[PDB]
Ligand binder design. Sequence first.
Ligand code: AKI
Length: 256
Amino acid sequence: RQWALEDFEIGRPLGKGKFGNVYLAREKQSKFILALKVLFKAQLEKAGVEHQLRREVEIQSHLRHPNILRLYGYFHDATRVYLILEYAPLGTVYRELQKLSKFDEQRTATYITELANALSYCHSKRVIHRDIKPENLLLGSAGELKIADFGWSVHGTLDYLPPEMIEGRMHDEKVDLWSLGVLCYEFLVGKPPFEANTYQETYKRISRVEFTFPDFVTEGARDLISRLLKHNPSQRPMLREVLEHPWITANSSKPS
Ligand SMILES: O=C(Nc1ccccc1)Nc1ccc(CCNc2ncnc3oc(-c4ccccc4)c(-c4ccccc4)c23)cc1
């Protein structure tokens, strides 16, 4: 499988990513619908992220899960690199958040389950997704959550980063559980738990784990978030304890 630009009809712009635009597109021979991300050779070098992208592509084509976004392949011409992507009709959870303001406990729990599964499968394959955020959470046709962008994976706004990562310290799979906590809080409250107007100060909040709950947040939710957002990685739940959780299970529509 080696592609080229003329293999595809280019469709509407889907939106800007910080390193490239995305377009709907359709492979001419099969009429297969998909997303195509146009990245520039020049911008990629300048930031020293060209090797980062190779890592991703490599990592991605090892991965297959109903709740992870497929990468079908890649290719370059002179000026640019192209990522051939599974297309996610229902857009970002980020957009659904702004549209809805905040999610109810049923949508929240379901997403956490879908994320945990997806995250749980990744861990078993020795892979960590360093920065998960609502921008990187797409929806499928049935409304399934799909994690995007492994380009940071291993082994800008700070809201979703755990202490160990911002304190310039050493990090393990326990990173992702912090991210679950931040996401879980944000879904229910409608904005992330450390959010500030400065970087320097979001830095403090995250570092001190300094957050409080609006009053409409049930004990069950507080219990899970409180357990996920722990300063010490090793104190954070197993991905399965999350999947077991009595507020997850009482609320969630999807299996585990
Ligand atoms: O970008 C990297 N890695 C990387 C890149 C450069 C340097 C280093 C690493 N990975 C990466 C990151 C993000 C993506 C997601 C690309 N959007 C998408 N990918 C697939 N289907 C999609 O469908 C949509 C869609 C948009 C609006 C309305 C309805 C549907 C999008 C979409 C595109 C831009 C913004 C918001 C959503 C979308 C894909 C890959």
